[PDB]
RNA sequence: GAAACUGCGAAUGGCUCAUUAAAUCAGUUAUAGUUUGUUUGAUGGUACGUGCUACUCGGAUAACCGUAGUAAUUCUAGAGCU
RNA sequence: UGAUUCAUGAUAACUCGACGGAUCGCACGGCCUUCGUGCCGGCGACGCAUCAUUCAAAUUUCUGCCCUAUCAACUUUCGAUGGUAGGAUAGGGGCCUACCAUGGUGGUGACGGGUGACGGAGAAUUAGGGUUCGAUUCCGGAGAGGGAGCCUGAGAAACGGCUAC
């Protein structure tokens, strides 16, 4: 959430509650848009970037798995990688493709599934690319102890009632498997964004 | 839409005279107890739907949950097993 | 550092400094060695200091949060140099402003303040006539 | 007993006294909203029509329309209801309180009368004195009703708070306010922006 | 700018743990049994008249000013406004 | 979509009919056909409808809780138990209520009683294993003198609201 993230930059001493003056003068923008809400839902891959004489940031994970800043390029800031959190499916071409922060993006790609990821720009919300969820792809584990690790998909296991586990080969250690909700694919052979050491 | 499963075998099905379609099904279980380390056994009987019908007493079937039709009916007769001869 | 007399310098040192273009100012730590000496002063700081960073006014700049440790000869506080007088006030909390001289602390009475608002709600009309009404009525 | 009497034509009020049992009993056992002949009430009140508007008894409890009874009854009140003002402390608050009947009795401390039609003879405190309007119509269409300017003329020049007046704040006497619903390019641009 | 009207909050917080012993509740599911102001982002040729006559703006209360009633009440009557 | 046939869409309809900003606020702009407050239209403010959504909730499934049989059968008065139907409410739902059947549950301790018996994360103290404790700046619920009933509102069976006793 925004308040924690902004404060990480500021923290030398005696700001914090005075975050409010910065927000209301609109010298913080998040994804090119005004939000002054501390309770704002955030996830991995949010872009922060502020007006004019500013900087660009990507949300990353520490050892716990809490949000922290890393500097990111201005070119990369224009783009954002967004999980398709939920889907309204098919006919007449009216998907609501939910994201973690709550952005909707509309209308067919020649695919679309839940747990697949959509590459989006930032301001206009038009579809740069669509990334399929499949084996061999690069993943970040969003939750648990295992957070801040990256690895390549060994296999996905499909079962009755839910598809229980999806297995990741790599880790600092050895293989681990996680739920589909924990898995956020962040790279594919078609389009990766992954060129980052990570977390723990 | 369907539920989480438990397997059970029928303790009942033929209890006093004339019965409305349903059976009582026992689960016995053991669990590790602190101190003694020896498991303590705890009975439980639950009243199952036989929407499928074709249910005789002392018959093992496999139960999948559905929404509670009156109260204590959690499971339903998904599928069976059947026996020999 | 810190201009001498006979009574030793009492070091003017800065440390952990980021210029942050959101708050629009300079935040840094003032770790003042006081070898063989007492308290530097709130004045003596902002009188040197000023001329290094070339803000060249005591008026806009504040130093605070001295605490210390046992054993003496050092104290740790925090101080900031601001880009403008007008800009500074908005970002700053009120507690800095009042001691600096930029603001006055208003003292209030809880009982007077809250009760008075309720009274305003209750009367509708001029209600001068009610005072005369009560006299007649007894 | 006491009467606080209104003549709405001037918009003035003052209280006047009627003492004599024969005069007073004309009011008695009548309901709220009923009209009353003036001459019975007093000689000075000749030609007048008085409508019983309400009043309060001793202990100050006010009449409420339609409730009936010569006595008092305890009834639920709500916000934005007669016999209730200054609002509840919270929204949606209801209060049970004693409230008086609409039926006139001797227990009344004051009866409120509103003059429906003016009589033959003047009443010194009420009719003889006169009060000008506190404010006049703010809205543009309402101004056209009273002042009969017509739609082309534009309201602002002619008007001000109850016609065109010049008045002092502190030490300056000299303008019109901004009348709204009045058609302006400000409304036109956003209205155009609908299409 | 005071106030008044409208809007929203006051359901939150804080406190206590009497009752309450499969109950609260915990882990864990289900919601294909549902709702959700706010947040986030999409989303409106429609509106009517034989689709050329047919529809483009109505008033009425508080602040107020004045007049009143009760021993008193988050008390309230009444007029002239708007 | 694992599983909705709902959705999307077709067709005939319902409706004392929901919405589409008259003061659509505020600060600015082009271009001229009668060079005309002509005719256009940007930006975001607050508000508007429907949808996904988020911040959320509430029911519900599995499993788990101290002590006692000097508590062995419990329940069906007036749903106990299940079926069928309906009305209700956001919704399934004995939820209640009609009709219908006669069940449900128990030695694996049910049913009953007691308990500073809130539950939990946790705490104390124990090598360990355990034992004991959990009023407590957190987490979830309950109550706010005792009880019932209800308005408003997204949401309260509110109590520094009401209404009644």
One DSSP character per residue, B33-45 reads PTTT-S------E
d(CA A72, CA A116): 24
| Rounded distance between C-alpha atoms, residue A180 and residue D52, angstroms | 78
SS3 state at C14: strand
Q: Which of C43, C41, C40 is nearest to C58 (CA)?
A: C43
Kindly tell me whether chain C and chain A come into contact, counting contact as 3+ Cβ pairs under 8 Å: yes
List all residues 6 or more positions away from D168 whose beta carbon is below 8 Å from its beta carbon: none
Q: Any chain C CB within 8 A of the CB of D109? A: no
CA D113, D118, D123 angle in degrees (round to 5)? Answer: 75
Q: How many residues does chain B have?
A: 85
C-beta of residue D13 within 8 angstroms of C-beta of residue D6: yes
What ranges in B2-84 are assigned the alpha helix state H?
none
> How many CB atoms within 10 Å of residue D19?
9
C contacts of D87 (beta carbons < 8 Å)? 121
Q: Which two tokens stand for residue A167?
A: 């297995």
Question: Is there a contact between A27 and C22 if contact means CB atoms under 8 Å apart?
Answer: yes
CB count within 10 Å of CB D134 equals 8
Angle ∠(D81,D86,D88) on CA atoms, nearest 5: 75
The rounded distance, in Å, linking the Cα atoms of B24 and C80 is: 77
D117 touches strand E (CB under 7 A): no
The verdict on a CB contact (< 8 Å) between A13 and C27 is yes
Q: How many helices (H) and strands (E) does chain A have?
A: 3, 11
Q: Which residues contact A137 (CB under 8 A, 6 or more apart)?
A: A131, A152, A153, A185, A187, A188, A189
Answer yes or no: is D15 CB < 7 A from strand E: yes
D172 CB contact with strand E at below 7 Å: no
Residue from A170, A110, A107 nearest A136 by CA: A170
Residue C138 tokens, joined: 């007894």
* Whole-angstrom distance, CA of residue C99 vs CA of residue C95: 7
Closest C-alpha among A105, A69, A73 to residue A87: A105
The nucleotide minimizing the C1' distance to residue D14's CA is: E67
| Number of Cβ pairs < 8 A linking chain A and chain C | 36
Backbone torsions φ then ψ of D119, nearest 5 degrees:
-85, -175
Distances (CA, A) of C92 to A86, C57, C79: 43, 17, 12
CA–C1' A9–E59 (A): 58
Residues of D in contact with C129 (CB under 8 A): none
What are the φ/ψ torsions at residue C80 (nearest 5 degrees)? -140, 150
Question: Residues of B6-30 as b/e, b for ≥16 C-beta within 10 angstroms?
Answer: bebebbbbeeeeeeeebbbbeeeee
Among A8, A9, A15, A20, which would you mutate to test the C interface (most chain C Cβ atoms within 10 Å of its Cβ)? A15
Strands A127-131 and A176-178: unpaired
Instruction: Tell me whether D59 touches chain C (CB under 8 Å).
Output: no
Do A27 and C20 make contact, defined as CB atoms within 8 angstroms?
no
Asked if D86 reaches chain C (Cβ–Cβ under 8 Å), the answer is yes
Q: What is the resolution of this structure in A?
A: 5.5
Method for structure elucidation: cryo-EM
Q: How many angstroms separate the Cα of B63 from the Cα of each of A164, B7, B31, D39, D81?
A: 20, 6, 22, 94, 62
**In chain C, which residue's Cα lies nearest the Cα of D86?**
C122
**Which of the 8 DSSP states describes residue A30?**
B
Alpha-carbon distance of C23 to A18, in angstroms, equals 9
Contact (CB, 8 A) for A90 and A107: no
In SS3 terms, C55-106 reads as CCCCCCCEEECCCCCCCCCEEEEEEEEECCHHHHHHHCCHHHHHHHCCCCCC
DSSP class of D30 = P
CA distance D44 to B8: 101
For D137, phi then psi, to 5°, come to: -60, 125
Residue found by looking up tokens 């909707």 in the block = A104
Closest nucleotide (C1' vs CA) to B29 is: F108
* Phi and psi angles of residue A101, each rounded to the nearest 5 degrees, phi first: -80, -20
**Yes or no, beta carbons of A14 and C78 under 8 Å apart:** yes
Between CA D106 and C1' F57 the distance (Å) reads 59
Q: Which of B41, B42, B48 is nearest to B5 (CA)?
A: B48
Residues 6+ apart with CB under 8 A from D44: D121, D123
**Whose CA is nearest the C1' atom of nucleotide F23?**
D181
Reported residue count of chain A is: 200
Q: Integer distance in angstroms from CA D162 to C1' F36?
A: 36
Tokens of C102: 């930029």
Question: Which nucleotide is the nearest neighbour of B68, by CA and C1'?
Answer: F93
Ranges of H-type helices in A86-196:
none
Q: What are C125's two structure tokens? A: 């009309």
DSSP D58: T
* Rounded CA separation A149/A139 (Å): 8
CA B40 / C1′ F126 distance in Å: 25
Sign of the C-alpha dihedral, residues C110, C116, C117, C118?
positive
Q: Are B79 and B61 in contact (CB under 8 A)?
A: yes
Tokens 């009309």 correspond to C125
- Exposed e or buried b for every residue in A93-111, given b needs 16+ CB within 10 A? eebebbbbbeeebeeeeee
Show residues of chain A in contact with C65, CB under 8 Å.
13-14
CA distance C108 to chain D (A): 25
The alpha carbon of residue C3 is apart from the nearest alpha carbon of chain A, in Å, by: 27
E30: residue with closest CA to C1': B3
Phi, psi of D145 (to 5 degrees): -65, -50
Phi, psi of A129 (to 5 degrees): -160, 165
Residue C129 Cα, gap to closest chain A Cα (Å) = 48
Contact between C124 and D87 using a beta-carbon 8 Å cutoff: no
| Cβ neighbours of residue A81 closer than 8 Å, sequence gap 6 or more | A45, A117, A119, A120, A131, A186, A193
Q: Do C22 and A18 touch (CB under 8 A)?
A: no
- CA of D7: nearest nucleotide by C1' is E79
Taking CA atoms, D195 is separated from D181, D188, D190, in Å, by 20, 11, 9
Name the residue with tokens 């949000």: A67
D3: the nucleotide nearest its CA (via C1') is: E68
**DSSP codes, D164-178:** S---BSSS-B-----
Asked if C51 is an interface residue toward chain D (Cβ–Cβ < 8 A), one would say no
A16 phi/psi in degrees, rounded to 5: 95, -65
Residue D27: partners with Cβ closer than 8 Å, 6 or more residues away: D36, D41, D52, D104, D111
Structure tokens at C128: 């001068």
**CA to C1' distance (Å), from A168 to F158:** 52
Residue from the list A10, A17, A28 with its beta carbon closest to the beta carbon of C20: A10
Rounded CA-CA distance B56/B23 in Å is 9
Paired sense of beta strands C14-20 and B75-79, if any: unpaired
For residue C13, give Cα distances in angstroms to A155, B77, B80, D76: 58, 80, 82, 74
Tokens 């994970």: give the residue: A61
Residue A162 to residue C66: CA distance in whole angstroms: 59
Nearest to D121 by CA among D31, D1, D4, D7: D7
* Cβ contact A80:A46 at 8 Å: yes
């Amino acid at each position: 959430p925004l308040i924690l993230i902004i404060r990480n930059r500021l923290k030398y001493a005696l700001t914090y509650r005075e975050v409010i003056s910065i927000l209301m003068q609109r010298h913080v923008l998040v994804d090119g848009k005004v939000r002054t809400d501390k309770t704002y839902p955030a996830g991995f891959m949010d872009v922060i970037s502020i007006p004019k004489t500013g900087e660009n940031y990507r949300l990353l994970y520490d050892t716990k798995g809490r949000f922290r800043l890393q500097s990111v390029k201005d070119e990369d800031a224009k783009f954002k990688l967004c999980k398709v959190r939920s889907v309204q499916f098919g006919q007449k071409g009216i998907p609501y493709l939910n994201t973690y922060d709550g952005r909707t993006i509309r209308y067919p790609d020649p695919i679309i599934k839940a747990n697949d990821t959509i590459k989006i720009d930032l301001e206009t919300n038009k579809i740069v690319d669509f990334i399929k969820f499949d084996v061999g792809n690069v993943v970040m584990v969003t939750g648990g102890r295992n957070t801040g690790r990256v690895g390549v998909i060994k296999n996905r296991e499909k079962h009755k009632g839910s598809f229980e586990t999806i297995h990741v080969e790599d880790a600092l250690g050895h293989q681990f498997a996680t739920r589909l909700g924990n898995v956020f694919t962040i790279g594919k052979g078609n389009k990766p964004w992954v060129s980052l050491p990570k977390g723990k | 839409g369907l539920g989480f499963k438990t397997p059970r075998e029928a303790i009942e099905g033929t209890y006093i005279d004339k019965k409305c379609p349903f059976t009582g099904t026992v689960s016995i279980r053991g669990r590790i107890i602190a101190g003694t380390c020896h498991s303590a056994k705890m009975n439980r009987t639950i009243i199952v739907r036989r929407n499928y019908l074709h249910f005789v007493k002392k018959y093992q079937r496999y139960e999948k949950r559905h929404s509670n039709i009156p109260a204590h009916v959690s499971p339903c007769f998904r599928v069976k097993e059947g026996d020999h001869v | 550092m810190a201009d001498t007399k006979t009574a030793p310098a009492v070091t003017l040192r800065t440390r952990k400094f980021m210029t942050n273009r959101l708050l629009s100012r300079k935040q840094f730590v003032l770790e003042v060695l006081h070898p063989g000496r007492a308290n530097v002063s709130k004045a003596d700081l902002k009188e040197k200091l000023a001329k290094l960073y070339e803000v060249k006014d005591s008026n806009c700049i504040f130093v605070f949060k001295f605490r210390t440790h046992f054993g003496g000869g050092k104290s740790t506080g925090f101080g900031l140099i601001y880009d403008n007088l007008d800009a500074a006030k908005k970002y700053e909390p009120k507690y800095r402003l009042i001691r600096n001289g930029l603001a006055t602390k208003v003292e209030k009475s809880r009982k007077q303040m809250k009760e008075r608002k309720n009274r305003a709600k209750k009367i509708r009309g001029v209600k001068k006539t009610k005072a005369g009404d009560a006299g007649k009525k007894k | 007993m006491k009467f606080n009497i209104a003549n709405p034509t001037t918009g003035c009020q003052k209280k006047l006294e009627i003492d004599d049992d024969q005069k007073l009993r004309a009011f008695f056992d009548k309901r709220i909203s009923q009209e009353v002949s003036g001459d019975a009430l007093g000689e000075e009140f000749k030609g007048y029509v008085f409508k019983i508007m309400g009043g309060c008894d001793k202990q100050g409890f006010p009449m409420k329309q339609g409730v009936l009874t010569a006595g008092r009854v305890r009834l639920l009140l709500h916000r934005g209801t007669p016999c209730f003002r200054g609002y509840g402390r919270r929204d949606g608050e209801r209060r049970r309180k004693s409230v008086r009947g609409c039926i006139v009795s001797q227990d009344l401390s004051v009866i409120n009368l509103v003059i429906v039609k003016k009589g033959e003879n003047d009443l010194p405190g009420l009719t003889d004195t006169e009060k000008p309007r506190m404010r006049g119509p703010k809205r543009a269409s309402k101004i056209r009703k009273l002042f009969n300017l017509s739609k082309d003329d534009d309201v602002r020049k002619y008007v001000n708070t109850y016609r065109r007046t010049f008045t002092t704040k502190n030490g300056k006497k000299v303008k019109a306010p901004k009348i709204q619903r009045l058609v302006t390019p400000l409304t036109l641009q956003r209205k155009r922006a609908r299409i």
